Amino acid sequence: TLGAELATGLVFTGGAGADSILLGATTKAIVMGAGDDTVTVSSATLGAGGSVNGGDGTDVLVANVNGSSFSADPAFGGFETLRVAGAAAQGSHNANGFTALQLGATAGATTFTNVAVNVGLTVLAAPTGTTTVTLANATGTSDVFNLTLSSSAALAAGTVALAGVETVNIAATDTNTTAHVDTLTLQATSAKSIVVTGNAGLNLTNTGNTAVTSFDASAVTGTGSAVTFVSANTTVGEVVTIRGGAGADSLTGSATANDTIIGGAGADTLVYTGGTDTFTGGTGADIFDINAIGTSTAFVTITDAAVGDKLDLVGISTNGAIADGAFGAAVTLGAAATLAQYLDAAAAGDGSGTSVAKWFQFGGDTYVVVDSSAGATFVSGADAVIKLTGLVTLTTSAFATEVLTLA
Numbered sequence: 001t002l003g004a005e006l007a008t009g010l011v012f013t014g015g016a017g018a019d020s021i022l023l024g025a026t027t028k029a030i031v032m033g034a035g036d037d038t039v040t041v042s043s044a045t046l047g048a049g050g051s052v053n054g055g056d057g058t059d060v061l062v063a064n065v066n067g068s069s070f071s072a073d074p075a076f077g078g079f080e081t082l083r084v085a086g087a088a089a090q091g092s093h094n095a096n097g098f099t100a101l102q103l104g105a106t107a108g109a110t111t112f113t114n115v116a117v118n119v120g121l122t123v124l125a126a127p128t129g130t131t132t133v134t135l136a137n138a139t140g141t142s143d144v145f146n147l148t149l150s151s152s153a154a155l156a157a158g159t160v161a162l163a164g165v166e167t168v169n170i171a172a173t174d175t176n177t178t179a180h181v182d183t184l185t186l187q188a189t190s191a192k193s194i195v196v197t198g199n200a201g202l203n204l205t206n207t208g209n210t211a212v213t214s215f216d217a218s219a220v221t222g223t224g225s226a227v228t229f230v231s232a233n234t235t236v237g238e239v240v241t242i243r244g245g246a247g248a249d250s251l252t253g254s255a256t257a258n259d260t261i262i263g264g265a266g267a268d269t270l271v272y273t274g275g276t277d278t279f280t281g282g283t284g285a286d287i288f289d290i291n292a293i294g295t296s297t298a299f300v301t302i303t304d305a306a307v308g309d310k311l312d313l314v315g316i317s318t319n320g321a322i323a324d325g326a327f328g329a330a331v332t333l334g335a336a337a338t339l340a341q342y343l344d345a346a347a348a349g350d351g352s353g354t355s356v357a358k359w360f361q362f363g364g365d366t367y368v369v370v371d372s373s374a375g376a377t378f379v380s381g382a383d384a385v386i387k388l389t390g391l392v393t394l395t396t397s398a399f400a401t402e403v404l405t406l407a
């Protein structure tokens with residue numbers, strides 16, 4: 001490995017090993033030989049008589065230039081991977097003739113054009129400006145892209161634009177054993193499925209990705225691999241599924257969607273914003289953050305509330321705050337009582353001054369109500385109802401700053 005750029009008149013001959021050099025506008029026939037070599041160019045066009053061959057092996061050409069189109073230049077050959085990285089790396093780079101793409105530190109926004117099918121991008125260092133991946137042919141109905149984040153420490157991959165791609169696979173990969181969390185802003189307006197894998201966290205900014213109906217990070221491993229996702233789906237009556245991984249995840253649906261959110265292992269936070277949502281915390285002390293009231297027929301159902309889990313109701317205390325204390329006895333009615341009668345009994349009091357919380361059990365499930373209205377009738381859209389699937393006792397569970405911790 002030589003770190004200083006070779007003089008343009010200097011001949012370099014690599015061997016059967018993995019050699020790495022920097023070139024300018026060379027006037028000589030540079031040969032890298034066998035092995036997986038790496039060549040970093042500071043000029044897209046070599047000098048008169050100059051050429052560089054990557055030789056046998058899987059060879060990396062690093063474009064430290066503002067724009068490149070190496071498949072058009074016969075002076076370059078034998079390079080399988082194209083990396084855009086360097087203090088001058090920038091502009092639009094032709095991916096034709098390359099089977100893999102890489103991205104490092106850059107001087108400004110980078111675009112990969114003519115990206116062939118089954119060609120992935122690996123981000124190795126924080127780039128500058130938006131990275132745009134333009135597929136050679138995105139006309140298909142089922143286009144897939146494999147984006148990889150690979151780093152030893154936390155990697156801010158920046159904004160990556162994948163237009164016309166229907167499935168985005170994101171690998172958040174840690175090369176050492178110390179837990180870290182990557183960040184990424186995904187612009188993929190045609191994506192319907194996002195799948196996250198790897199052994200590192202991912203805080204994914206998802207703004208504008210309105211077609212996603214599936215976020216699957218269930219394969220992510222590592223207790224420290226925190227995954228953060230906020231759904232952007234705005235389709236009326238849409239079904240959306242959001243799965244966390246092994247990490248302490250923060251998963252948020254959308255008000256318009258019927259979100260199925262599954263936290264997986266770890267201390268997960270599942271945020272309810274509206275619709276008919278289904279929350280499964282999984283193992284671990286999970287938090288169900290209730291930020292919208294919902295309606296009497298479109299509310300959240302928590303499938304696995306257990307001792308240790310919490311129920312955050314700060315967002316739904318329309319009037320004042322829910323008083324701190326242990327939950328009293330459940331509301332109990334007659335043998336033929338309906339859910340509507342249970343709802344009215346829970347909301348029979350006056351919540352206009354300060355919202356009150358009550359609970360009951362009906363049909364084999366447990367319900368939590370927040371009454372914020374003076375009337376004796378449950379008011380849909382003003383008073384809230386939360387459903388817990390099993391019969392769970394909330395008698396010894398206490399409210400602390402509007403958070404109920406199951407005991």
Ligand SMILES: [Sr+2]
Nearest residue numbers: 015017032034
């Ligand atoms: Sr070599």
Ligand SMILES: [Sr+2]
Nearest residue numbers: 035054056057
């Ligand atoms: Sr080689």
Ligand SMILES: [Sr+2]
Nearest residue numbers: 070071073076
């Ligand atoms: Sr070429």
Ligand SMILES: [Sr+2]
Nearest residue numbers: 055057059078
């Ligand atoms: Sr080669």
Ligand SMILES: [Sr+2]
Nearest residue numbers: 079080097098
């Ligand atoms: Sr090539």
Ligand SMILES: [Sr+2]
Nearest residue numbers: 138140143164
């Ligand atoms: Sr497409």
Ligand SMILES: [Sr+2]
Nearest residue numbers: 152174178180
């Ligand atoms: Sr690490």
Ligand SMILES: [Sr+2]
Nearest residue numbers: 254257274275
């Ligand atoms: Sr929802």
Ligand SMILES: [Sr+2]
Nearest residue numbers: 244245263265
């Ligand atoms: Sr999790």
Ligand SMILES: [Sr+2]
Nearest residue numbers: 264266281283
């Ligand atoms: Sr969990």
Ligand SMILES: [Sr+2]
Nearest residue numbers: 281282284286
């Ligand atoms: Sr749990």
Ligand SMILES: [Sr+2]
Nearest residue numbers: 289291314315
């Ligand atoms: Sr909240």
Ligand SMILES: [Sr+2]
Nearest residue numbers: 317318320321
């Ligand atoms: Sr309040």
Ligand SMILES: [Sr+2]
Nearest residue numbers: 347349373375
């Ligand atoms: Sr009331």
